[PDB]
Amino acid sequence: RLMKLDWERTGRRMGFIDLSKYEVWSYDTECTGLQYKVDKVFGFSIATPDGQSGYFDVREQPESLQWLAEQVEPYKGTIVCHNASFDYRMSLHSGIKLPLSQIDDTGIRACCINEHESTIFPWTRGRAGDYSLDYLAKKYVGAQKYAEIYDELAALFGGKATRKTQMPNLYRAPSGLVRKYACPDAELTLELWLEQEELIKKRGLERIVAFERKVMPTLIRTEARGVRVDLDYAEQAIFKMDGVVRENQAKMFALAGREFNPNSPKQVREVFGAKEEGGVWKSRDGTILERTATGNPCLDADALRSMTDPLAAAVLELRSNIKTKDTFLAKHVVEHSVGGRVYPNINQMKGEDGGTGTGRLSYTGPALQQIPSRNKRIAAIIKPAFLPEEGQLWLDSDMASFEVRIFAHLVAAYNPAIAKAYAENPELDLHQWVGDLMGIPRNASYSGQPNAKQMNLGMIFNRGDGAVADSLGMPWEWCEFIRYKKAGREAKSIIAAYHSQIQGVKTLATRAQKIAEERGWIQTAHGRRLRFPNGYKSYKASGILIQATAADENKENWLRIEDALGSDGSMILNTHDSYSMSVDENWKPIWERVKKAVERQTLRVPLLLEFDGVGKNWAEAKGL
């Protein structure tokens, strides 16, 4: 069906062939489940660039691990998996040592090539699209697994005849069936990797593709190491969250005037006062609600966040703390822990919000980035559950004012004063440095008082003049066009005065949006391509550049820390702009090496790593 190889003629029967005769080959594991350090590999499959492919049940045929180890020890070429982290770790636990610097990831390559596989544009047709192998193979090589195996599986086990339903069953099926399932997987993976070479070659993505490949071993190593936990405390924390939830509930019933079930869509419509008029749905705080497909007024999380109603923040707070007690604590740290540690997965390309279009990484199971930062009470309940390595101390540090320095550096191209200001005072606070020039304060003391922080943050998130006015408490009002926030007379004066005292901020926004509209994309200095199909949301161009450049330099941090610790320690984790490390008891020499290895002046403004504290666990290092 228009493919390089014809796998049905040549494949599915490969044996202990010689793999050194290839520059690339495919690899795919089948495991008893998904839990690292618990489930084990039960078989695997490999495809070769000359039409061969094979599957081996390691239980029935243990001669194939010996051949594998033999093939892999001299092998100098590229190994391809779709999920390099999963395949390499499940193998490692099962005693299959692959050379990690030689593994490649079809899904990370897919993100470098188009970050919007799941983005819903105003013109899309169907369901989302994603980074699964089935979907990327269909879209890029036009290939697809035959549905006959899923039917055979369902006839054996029961459920829907789908990959999602039948994967948990594969180690229970006869190996000739898993051979029909697993061989095309390695075939489609190698054909995907082959077609990505062309697209990466034709589109000049060699730099960002190489960068993420350089990053990958440092995250799989970290992923495989895990974080040590204190489970005896963790059970105590679930009793503390109990009280925190009971309070969240009381505060929420108070704001509604009654008790109710936040899980009943009807009662949540009642407490927020959702009324319809002339085709429009409003909630009691005046917010205009969109409709659900079912025609109901939509009160999802995106809508709650857009309200000023305190009841919205209360609902979201209660949902969040329930998820922290039940999913974060009970399930991921207490239940699924293994020998006193937890092993979350690190998504190298998907950020904390599920967005793919920025270099951001993010944890799952437990989601360590989802411990709050503006509620020190919750962090103080959770963070004592996380421990350094046995014998070591917990060192916490912070990239100070990270995303603002990235901003300063991009606009520093069009303003040498910003570069010189940070040169004299490397610890300069950009907000205070702008307030000190406009004659306005860094922060608000009174409502309606203009401040530098809110100004600076409205340039960072490309924000219209009314959005800026609103964040300041300055007069504004709604207007048709269809609906938008029109800035008042007093707000357009400070925004204009802002762009006169701070030259270059407007040039950042405009050149970024322009190039996004002409050429179709812009790029970080590491070469991450940020794409704006049909100029969609192109006015956001400069802000997204900041998130991406700051995510580039964050992956640059892991590389530099992991190297600087060496044998003296290990990076525990990274949340937001913070970096935790397990270090030896003589910690000051180790810390000063990490600090000089990370702190750099290779951008237009310095990057600083500021010490945060040391302790016997995560909370104590932070001072809680």
Residue numbers in the entry: -1 to 479, 487 to 629
Article, verbatim:
Here, we present the crystallographic structure of the apo form of DpoZ of vibriophage ϕVC8, composed of the 3′-5′ exonuclease and polymerase domains. Through extensive screening and optimization, we could eventually obtain single crystals that diffracted to 2.8 Å. The two molecules contained in the asymmetric unit of the DpoZ crystal represent different conformations. The transition between the two forms of the molecule involves mainly two subdomains moving mostly as rigid-bodies: the thumb subdomain known to hold the nascent double-stranded DNA and an extension in the exonuclease domain, present in a reduced form in only a few other PolA structures (see below). Thus, the two DpoZ conformations are hereafter referred to as the ‘thumb-exo’ open and ‘thumb-exo’ closed states. Their RMSD is 2.0 Å for the whole chain, 1.8 Å for the polymerase domain and 1.4 Å for the exonuclease module. Importantly, modelling of the dsDNA substrate in the polymerase domain of DpoZ indicates that the thumb subdomain in its closed state prevents the correct binding of the nucleic acid substrate. The three insertions conserved in the ϕVC8-like DpoZ subfamily take the form of external loops of several to about twenty residues, scattered around the polymerase domain's active site. Indeed, modelling a leaving nucleotide in the exo catalytic site in the thumb-exo open conformation showed that residues R161 and M165 of the helix E2 could contact the nucleobase. Interestingly, although their side-chains are unstructured in the absence of this leaving nucleotide, in the closed state these residues are much closer to the core of the exonuclease domain, assuming a particular conformation which blocks the active site from accepting a nucleotide.
